[PDB]
């Protein structure tokens, strides 16, 4: 077996049926314009070299066999400092079916880049993307696919949401091509549609602002002859407004 050559080299195009099971949709960092997501990134592909016939039909093995055989060099186009978990052992599974099909699942914590247009912040919704594909192999050599229907190929665990100020409405997937001077590369994209929960900002900036303006309008009921009281009423409210604005900008990049 040669680890350096893809299956069916020179005769076929290696089709990899990928799939994502979102174990937990991690917190969204608006400051870094990125989001964390822990997944069971599964890939499946046919390799005629790894065809056997024995007492068992499927060989469930560990990562040691995964390192010994060819696996797709899938990388996330907008990934930023992802980690493949290693405790206790490399969190990977390899399963060689007797026909030659491989099922290679890995547990990942991918910190993908999500460019956000914060024009309507905090009443804003963002379609955070997750695009992945082969790095070294062009569309003529490695093509990706969804193992199930595209709608049913990115499953999110029910009690997995780690979002604090966001609501995962859903996800939508697609497949496309990236043009490059190096070549044409097949890309699998999935957009997670998040909607920011305004609850925190209502009681952190909106309520203080409304109470401050009502406090300033309280001065219209004080007698005009009380100059120090209404003067401090006004100046303290304006200074509070400046502090509120400055402390509201720091919540965003």
């Amino acid at each position, epitope marked *: 077996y040669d680890n350096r050559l893809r299956p069916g080299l020179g005769e076929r195009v290696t089709e990899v049926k990928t799939d994502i099971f979102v174990t937990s949709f991690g917190p969204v960092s608006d400051h870094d314009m990125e989001y964390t997501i822990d997944v069971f990134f599964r890939q499946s592909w046919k390799d005629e070299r790894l065809k056997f016939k024995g007492p068992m039909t499927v060989l469930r093995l560990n990562n040691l066999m995964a390192s010994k055989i060819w696996t797709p060099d899938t990388f996330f186009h907008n990934g930023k400092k992802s980690v493949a978990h290693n405790m206790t052992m490399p969190n990977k599974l390899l399963r060689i079916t007797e*026909d030659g099909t491989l099922l290679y699942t890995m547990r990942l914590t991918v910190r993908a880049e999500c460019p956000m247009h914060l024009e309507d912040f905090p009443m804003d919704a963002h379609a955070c993307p997750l695009k992945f594909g082969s790095y070294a192999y062009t569309r003529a050599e490695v093509v990706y*696919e*969804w193992t199930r*229907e*595209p709608a*049913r190929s990115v499953v999110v665990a029910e009690d997995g949401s780690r979002l604090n100020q966001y609501d995962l409405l859903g996800q939508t*997937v*697609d*497949s496309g091509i990236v043009q490059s001077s190096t070549g044409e590369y097949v890309v699998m994209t999935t957009h997670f549609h998040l909607k920011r929960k305004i609850g925190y900002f209502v009681i952190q900036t909106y309520l203080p602002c409304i109470m401050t303006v009502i406090l300033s309008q309280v001065s219209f009921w004080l007698n005009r002859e009380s100059v120090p009281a209404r003067t401090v009423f006004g100046v303290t409210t304006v200074l509070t407004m400046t502090t509120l604005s400055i402390s509201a900008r720091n919540s965003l990049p």
Partner: antibody
Framework: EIQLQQSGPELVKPGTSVKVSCKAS????????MYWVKQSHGKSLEWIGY????????TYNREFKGKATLTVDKSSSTAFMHLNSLTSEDSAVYYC???????????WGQGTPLTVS | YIVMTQSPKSMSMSLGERVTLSCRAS??????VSWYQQKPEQSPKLLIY???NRYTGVPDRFAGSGSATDFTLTITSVQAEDLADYHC????????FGGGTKLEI
């Protein structure tokens, strides 16, 4: 090349089950799912269900859930659809389609007209 | 499921002119919207896969287009062989098909 040959047309009384075959020869049978589509005369194509031949894993439409049963013979490389409790509306033309990938159905079946009276 | 709507139920156009057949998807379908050609008493034939990708063996006059829910199949010059029933189907979710546009003269 790829050729999907289906069983010839037949007529059956209402309430009597019937099976329709789909033989593939060009490609390796277990690599791609086999879908079944019903088309009544003058109406839109309707999806019944599909079978993953390697493990025989089946998924059915809600309307045809229980009306149709999908089976497979890997050795003969044939996909079988079994319709039971046939009614008047079940008379239609049935095709078997081969789904190359998530995008398109590559090769369709020739067509098995079904009539009840 | 996703319901596909074919706006032109039956289009009547002469030979050698541009014709566009529309297709609407109820929900998001991405680029998983294929077009099929079905002559009378014949099985469907795939013409356009993806959203605009032309299937092999298809004349260059056929051209698909569409991003999310609006999809169009355009014939630059209708030939005598281009008179058949045209269906649009989505494979993003469980497969469904539209009513089927028929081309006439």
């Amino acid at each position: 090349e790829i050729q999907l040959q289906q069983s010839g047309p037949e007529l059956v009384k209402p309430g009597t089950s019937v099976k329709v075959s789909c033989k593939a020869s060009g490609y390796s049978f277990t690599d791609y799912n086999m879908y079944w589509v019903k088309q009544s005369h003058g109406k839109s194509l309707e999806w019944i269900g599909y079978i993953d031949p390697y493990n025989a894993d089946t998924t059915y439409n809600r309307e045809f859930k229980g009306k149709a049963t999908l089976t497979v013979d890997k050795s003969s490389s044939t996909a079988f659809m079994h319709l039971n409790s046939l009614t008047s509306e079940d008379s239609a033309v049935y095709y078997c389609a081969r789904k190359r990938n998530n995008f398109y159905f590559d090769y369709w079946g020739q067509g098995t007209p079904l009539t009840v009276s | 499921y996703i319901v596909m709507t074919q706006s032109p139920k039956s289009m009547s156009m002469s030979l050698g002119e541009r014709v566009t057949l529309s297709c609407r998807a109820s929900e998001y379908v991405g680029s998983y919207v294929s077009w099929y050609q079905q002559k009378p008493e014949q099985s469907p034939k795939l013409l356009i896969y993806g959203a605009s990708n032309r299937y092999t063996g298809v004349p260059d006059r056929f051209a698909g287009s569409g991003s999310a829910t609006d999809f169009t199949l355009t014939i630059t010059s209708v030939q005598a062989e281009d008179l058949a029933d045209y269906h649009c189907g989505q494979t993003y979710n469980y497969p469904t098909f539209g009513g089927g546009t028929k081309l006439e003269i």
